[PDB]
Amino acid sequence: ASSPANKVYQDRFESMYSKIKDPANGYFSEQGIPYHSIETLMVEAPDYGHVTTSEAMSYYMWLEAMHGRFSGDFTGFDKSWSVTEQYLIPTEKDQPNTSMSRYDANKPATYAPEFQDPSKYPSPLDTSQPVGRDPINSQLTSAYGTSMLYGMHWILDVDNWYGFGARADGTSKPSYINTFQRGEQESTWETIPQPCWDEHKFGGQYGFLDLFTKDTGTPAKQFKYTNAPDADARAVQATYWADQWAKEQGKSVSTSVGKATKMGDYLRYSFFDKYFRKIGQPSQAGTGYDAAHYLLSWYYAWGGGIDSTWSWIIGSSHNHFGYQNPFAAWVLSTDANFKPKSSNGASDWAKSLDRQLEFYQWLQSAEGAIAGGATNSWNGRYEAVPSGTSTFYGMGYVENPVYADPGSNTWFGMQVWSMQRVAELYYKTGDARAKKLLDKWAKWINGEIKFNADGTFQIPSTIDWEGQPDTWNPTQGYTGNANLHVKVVNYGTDLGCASSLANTLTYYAAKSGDETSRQNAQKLLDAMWNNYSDSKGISTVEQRGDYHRFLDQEVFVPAGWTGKMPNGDVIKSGVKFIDIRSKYKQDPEWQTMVAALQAGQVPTQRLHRFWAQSEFAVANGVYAILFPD
Ligand SMILES: CO[C@@H]1O[C@H](CO)[C@@H](O[C@@H]2O[C@H](CO)[C@@H](S[C@@H]3O[C@H](CO)[C@@H](O[C@@H]4O[C@H](CO)[C@@H](O)[C@H](O)[C@H]4O)[C@H](O)[C@H]3O)[C@H](O)[C@H]2O)[C@H](O)[C@H]1O
Ligand SMILES: CO[C@@H]1O[C@H](CO)[C@@H](O[C@@H]2O[C@H](CO)[C@@H](S[C@@H]3O[C@H](CO)[C@@H](O[C@@H]4O[C@H](CO)[C@@H](O)[C@H](O)[C@H]4O)[C@H](O)[C@H]3O)[C@H](O)[C@H]2O)[C@H](O)[C@H]1O
Ligand SMILES: [Ca+2]
């Protein structure tokens, strides 16, 4: 039997679970896939409300696991895994083993430079630049008996809104698409949505391929997928709790545990430099593990030919603290039920745990907030690191890893999503490293939570940075980083971030006994329940300051390149964001948004983001379990 839980907060989880699963609320598609948000007019990471992400799927898993804990029914959790495997992990038809089996571990991919401006793309492939060796492929094919990769592609056009269909048929749903392709300055407003399976049926003469990379000959028909490591690691974290909670009740989610374990094994591809170059010596090709930074980088991607057999796989040189998950690393390296089948799976994850904790500590500012990250590829072209730039294992510090429009580390959300995992690790193991990080971080954030007399509240929203951490010396450890500072630019009432914050403070308070953290977590949960509830979960009105880009953001299209989106929209130099997504004018909220822009006002929206609703529900569940009385 599971220990008794606080009935007040358990009821709140149950109420939220009902609203999220209610068919009338519209959080899911007819195929059972959760959308990024109920509302369709939505641009922030994905550019349409009804596309889904692997992030949403991992929150769906977490939600169902918690529901299993209170209802004793885990069929919903097993269902979240079935939907994931069927729709987000490319099937045998989506990543043909005929092509994947032609992979060459000694030449994983062909080098191509990254540019700081989208106008420099397509990027030219250069076969003369060195590429290191992939040491884990043989481990995976041997353990699993296939060359296909088991990980989630990060974004999916659920209802085929863009019209690419499945494997170029234009009519099936869901539809594998990707967006970001052109570097740090390519915001969500500057992409050209493209299909993962490109047979040249849509777009230009060669589909959309030559908008991004340029080779010596004619582009081949090909498929390509991109993983979001933070989502796959969250899926493992969620499955661990589902396993623990099921066993406390004589139930089992054994089959889902096996899927999470296999996913964690392939997830190791994010531990490697993009083109397998040695960590700390970027001009040199790696010989295997010397190319592993052991952190959960921004992505690992793979692809291959559709009508001819060949394939490639790349890791990522860019690392952001917000993607790390020491808890998932702890589970995969120590729990016998989650031991990966591969020979080095568990030990690699053990190395990642130690490295991740060093990374967090190295990035901790004077105040306590965690700074951006580091890269093994300066400017995305393995350029020389400027003199005076701090390093972590030879990797140069970057304030906003991967994206600069807006900076990937200017959103407060990265703080809570990531530190929440450190709090779970601390709660379970009492790890001294996690303790030192949390004591300082929690003291910082507790001084930034503002409660108003009318029941509303505010927490940091946009943050900024000054300075850099001192160069990491593993034997010296944390120096205090006196010259690295966080600055809060503005506060807000992001319900998803506040929920993640309550979750982090709850785990931490439960282990440390810090009363200040416990009462702030409860006050946050209470304020949200009492003042922000609505018939669909919780919400508030927020300003969408970037929406002017719907109409004024020019999208770069190379000189001479012309094509068409499936609905007929012409792609050519001079198009704006809206010109290649004309179906958006049919959105119920379109006239309202345009009217605001016309009057010189900032459009506002009342949004129901799936992850935020689940975050709130899970946060109530966690509080109910850790503070029974
Ligand atoms: C943050 O988002 C991610 O950004 C990165 C930025 O780099 C994106 O990475 C890029 O992804 C592209 C696909 O989405 C690929 S294009 C692809 O590269 C392979 C490997 O080099 C090429 O394979 C070669 O093809 C030749 C035949 O055409 C063969 O002769 C040769 O042996 C093959 O290796 C393929 O042709 C290209 O089309 C970029 O390589 C990669 O940088 C990431 O996608 C975003 O999600
Ligand atoms: C007077 O001018 C206005 O000032 C206000 C001051 O509050 C500005 O409002 C603020 O705008 C910010 C940007 O629009 C948002 S932060 C925004 O939040 C969303 C939801 O949490 C984030 O999306 C998530 O991003 C993740 C990381 O990429 C994804 O993984 C996830 O799926 C997404 O949901 C997004 O990244 C953030 O940028 C403030 O909340 C708001 O107060 C206003 O803009 C000015 O006009
Ligand atoms: Ca830009």
DSSP 531-569: HHEETTEE--EEE-TTTTHHHH-B----TT--EE-TT-P
Residues with CB under 6 A from ligand 2: 44-45, 55, 411, 413, 461, 490, 492, 494, 496-497, 542-546, 602, 609
CA–centroid distance, residue 189 to ligand 3 (Å): 8
Tokens 């390509």, residue located = 224
Q: 541-606 belongs to which CATH class?
A: few secondary structures
Yes or no: say if 363 and 370 are a contact pair by the CB < 8 Å rule: yes
CA–centroid distance, residue 467 to ligand 2 (Å): 24
How far, in whole angstroms, is CA 168 from its chain's centroid? 26
Q: 3-class SS at 336?
A: helix
Backbone angles phi, psi at 565, to 5 degrees: -80, 165
In the residue annotation, 464 being an active-site residue is answered as no
Q: Closest ligand 1 atom to the C-alpha of 402?
A: 1
Yes or no: say if 395 and 375 are a contact pair by the CB < 8 Å rule: yes
What is the identity of the amino acid at 366?
A
Catalytic residue, from 47, 55, 78, 273: name it: 55
Does domain 90-136+153-226+300-314 fall into CATH 2.60.40.10?
A: no
Sequence-distant (≥ 6) Cβ neighbours of residue 116 within 8 angstroms: 183, 184, 185, 379, 380
By most ligand atoms within 8 Å of CB, the mutation choice from 60, 461, 463 for ligand 2 is: 461
Backbone angles phi, psi at 109, to 5 degrees: -160, 180
| Terminal-residue alpha carbon distance, the chain | 18
**Ion ligand 3 — residues with CB under 5 Å?**
185, 187, 405
Yes or no: say if 242 and 72 are a contact pair by the CB < 8 Å rule: no
- 145 by Cβ neighbours in 10 Å (0-12 / 13-18 / 19+) ranks as exposed
Rounded to 5 degrees, what angle do the CA atoms 177, 462, 468 make?
95
Yes or no: say if 535 and 24 are a contact pair by the CB < 8 Å rule: no
Backbone angles phi, psi at 604, to 5 degrees: -125, 155
Structure tokens at 384: 């020389």
Ligand lying nearest the CA atom of residue 597: 2
Structure tokens at 350: 């053990």
Resolution rounded to one decimal, in angstroms: 2.0
Ligand 1 atom 5 nearest Cα: 181
- The DSSP bridge pattern shows strands 541-543 and 395-398 to be unpaired
- Is 529 near ligand 1, meaning CB less than 6 Å away? no
Select from 14, 81, 1, 4 the least CA-distant residue to 620: 14
Tokens 């994206």, residue located = 403
By most ligand atoms within 8 Å of CB, the mutation choice from 181, 197, 223, 310 for ligand 1 is: 181
| Every domain of the chain and the residues it spans | 1-89+137-152+227-298+315-540+607-628, 90-136+153-226+300-314, 541-606
- Is 104 near ligand 1, meaning CB less than 6 Å away? no
Catalytic residue, from 64, 230, 431, 494: name it: 230
Helix (H) or strand (E) holding 581: none
Q: 1-89+137-152+227-298+315-540+607-628 belongs to which CATH class?
A: mainly alpha
Tokens 């001079």, residue located = 574
Backbone angles phi, psi at 203, to 5 degrees: 90, -125
Ligand lying nearest the CA atom of residue 405: 3
DSSP 35: P
- Dihedral of the alpha carbons of 576, 580, 585, 589, in degrees to the nearest 10: -80
Structure tokens at 403: 């994206």
In the residue annotation, 85 being an active-site residue is answered as no
Q: 3-class SS at 18?
A: helix
- Is 244 near ligand 1, meaning CB less than 6 Å away? no
Yes or no: say if 129 and 241 are a contact pair by the CB < 8 Å rule: no
* Dist CA 315 CA 477 (whole Å): 28
Structure tokens at 413: 């959300």
